[PDB]
Amino acid sequence: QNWQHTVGKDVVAGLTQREIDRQEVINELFVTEASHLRTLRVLDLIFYQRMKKENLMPREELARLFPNLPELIEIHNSWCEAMKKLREEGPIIKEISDLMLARFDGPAREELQQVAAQFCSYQSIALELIKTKQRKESRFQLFMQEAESHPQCRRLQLRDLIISEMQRLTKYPLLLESIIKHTEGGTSEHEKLCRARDQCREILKYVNEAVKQTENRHRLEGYQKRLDATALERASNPLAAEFKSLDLTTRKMIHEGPLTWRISKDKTLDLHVLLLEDLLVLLQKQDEKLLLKCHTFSPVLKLNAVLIRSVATDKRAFFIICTSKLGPPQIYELVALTSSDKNTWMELLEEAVRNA
Amino acid sequence: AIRKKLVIVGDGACGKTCLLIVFSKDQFPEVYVPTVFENYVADIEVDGKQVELALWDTAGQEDYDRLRPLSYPDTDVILMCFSIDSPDSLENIPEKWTPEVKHFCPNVPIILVGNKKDLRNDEHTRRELAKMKQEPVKPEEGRDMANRIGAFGYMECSAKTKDGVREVFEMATRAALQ
Numbered sequence: 001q002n003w004q005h006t007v008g009k010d011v012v013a014g015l016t017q018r019e020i021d022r023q024e025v026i027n028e029l030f031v032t033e034a035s036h037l038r039t040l041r042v043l044d045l046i047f048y049q050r051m052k053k054e055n056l057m058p059r060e061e062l063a064r065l066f067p068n069l070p071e072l073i074e075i076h077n078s079w080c081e082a083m084k085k086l087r088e089e090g091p092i093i094k095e096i097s098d099l100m101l102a103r104f105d106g107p108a109r110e111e112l113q114q115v116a117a118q119f120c121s122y123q124s125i126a127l128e129l130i131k132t133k134q135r136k137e138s139r140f141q142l143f144m145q146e147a148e149s150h151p152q153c154r155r156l157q158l159r160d161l162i163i164s165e166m167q168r169l170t171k172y173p174l175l176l177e178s179i180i181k182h183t184e185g186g187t188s189e190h191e192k193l194c195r196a197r198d199q200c201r202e203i204l205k206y207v208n209e210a211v212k213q214t215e216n217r218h219r220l221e222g223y224q225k226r227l228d229a230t231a232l233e234r235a236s237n238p239l240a241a242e243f244k245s246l247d248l249t250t251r252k253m254i255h256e257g258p259l260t261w262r263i264s265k266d267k268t269l270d271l272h273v274l275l276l277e278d279l280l281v282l283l284q285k286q287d288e289k290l291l292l293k294c295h296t297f298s299p300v301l302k303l304n305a306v307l308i309r310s311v312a313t314d315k316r317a318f319f320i321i322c323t324s325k326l327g328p329p330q331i332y333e334l335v336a337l338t339s340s341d342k343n344t345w346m347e348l349l350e351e352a353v354r355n356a
Numbered sequence: 357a358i359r360k361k362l363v364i365v366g367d368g369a370c371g372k373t374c375l376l377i378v379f380s381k382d383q384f385p386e387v388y389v390p391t392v393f394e395n396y397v398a399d400i401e402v403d404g405k406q407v408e409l410a411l412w413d414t415a416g417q418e419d420y421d422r423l424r425p426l427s428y429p430d431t432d433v434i435l436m437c438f439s440i441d442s443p444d445s446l447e448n449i450p451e452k453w454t455p456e457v458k459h460f461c462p463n464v465p466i467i468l469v470g471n472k473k474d475l476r477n478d479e480h481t482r483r484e485l486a487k488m489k490q491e492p493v494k495p496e497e498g499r500d501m502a503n504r505i506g507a508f509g510y511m512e513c514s515a516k517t518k519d520g521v522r523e524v525f526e527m528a529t530r531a532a533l534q
Contacts, residue, residue, distance in 0.1 A: 145380050340452070
């Protein structure tokens with residue numbers, strides 16, 4: 001239920017409204033932490049321990065789906081116990097900042113962010129794998145329907161459940177911001193909650209980056225195998241010849257997306273393009289192949305030798321201008337799906353250019 | 357059972373979490389409004405059919421571009437929200453939310469939701485936005501944005517009063533069945 005009408009029933013009247021609110025938010029943090037812990041334990045018991053012991057899949061697949069569940073559990077369990085220690089000294093909780101810093105600052109921040117990153121980074125890929133395997137293996141499918149029918153799943157699928165570490169982590173700044181709002185300003189307590197809130201955001205930043213990088217590498221690995229740079233070992237413009245052995249697996253990817261190329265007069269050419277760190281790669285989609293071909297225009301631009309410019313009439317187009325004096329006095333006009341898109345694309349390109 | 361996955365998106369503070377709470381409780385939380393809504397399967401009936409509608413909040417994911425998409429797979433309907441008291445939030449519908457939902461949830465119906473309609477005529481609200489040379493979002497702006505982004509439907513509601521809450525979810529459920 002609810003803190004006032006719950007515990008604090010006798011003690012509620014001698015308190016201010018701001019202190020009532022404050023104890024509700026705390027109470028919500030604490031109760032939802034226990035609830036999170038319980039969810040991790042359903043993952044453990046209903047899915048992970050059974051997958052292992054019955055050999056539903058190889059060890060190596062399973063380790064990618066639950067890299068470090070026991071460690072994750074103990075992160076949240078330890079903090080939950082410290083929470084309970086606190087609740088013990090009376091139902092009106094007092095200073096809380098130290099308990100927050102003990103989870104979200106310093107070494108504790110380094111640990112949580114690493115353990116969560118490791119658990120989430122690969123998750124989207126491992127869930128596709130699980131979806132495939134359900135489609136293709138009658139035993140795995142039967143084990144899944146059965147495990148998900150357990151009452152503790154609360155009618156959720158594994159996947160509704162496994163994303164909970166990530167969702168939980170996103171709740172912490174909100175929870176802290178809302179404890180802060182009802183905390184007396186000018187206190188050490190207030191300053192320290194603000195710190196804890198700032199550190200939670202940073203941790204989220206780190207987990208964001210881990211997912212990004214892990215998904216992007218797997219994706220680029222996929223793109224490499226579909227990469228036809230065959231019309232390049234003998235090109236017709238030395239601008240493009242050095243990229244005849246181009247490995248996308250060695251560069252970091254910033255953005256990617258479909259783009260229509262006004263190459264000439266009311267001719268167009270549908271692309272899928274990769275904004276990498278050093279490079280813009282224009283690729284043509286042959287079936288399930290990705291062609292790095294010429295036209296003539298080169299299909300690979302070095303970002304330190306370009307300029308990006310907007311367009312006067314077309315809220316979807318943008319220009320790419322090779323300032324490398326030995327190449328295209330012709331620009332590359334590219335159209336995005338929409339204005340928002342063209343915007344996004346512009347900003348990322350201007351940024352990447354600046355840093356190239 | 358018929359099981360459908362609903363995910364609610366839009367700018368922070370534009371009432372996502374509150375909206376999901378009133379619908380699932382059928383009561384606006386009197387004493388305390390919770391920050392947190394956990395993934396939850398609600399039962400709803402529409403056009404006479406029983407449906408398990410799985411509800412996913414994204415509050416707190418707005419700043420994290422590569423965390424949010426983890427919510428998208430297998431989605432059957434999107435509830436895309438803006439808040440009537442924030443025309444900033446409406447401009448982000450075509451600007452941020454639509455391209456992202458079209459890209460990660462292709463061919464998935466979208467219902468555009470104007471939250472907080474109980475504020476279109478709150479006085480305190482109108483001024484603060486008259487400050488910034490703004491005023492509450494008007495129904496026609498909402499409906500035109502729906503047609504512009506190709507939404508299945510446009511709805512407005514207020515969580516405070518509950519007005520239109522049920523209807524949001526009923527529409528969202530009809531969309532998921534088409």
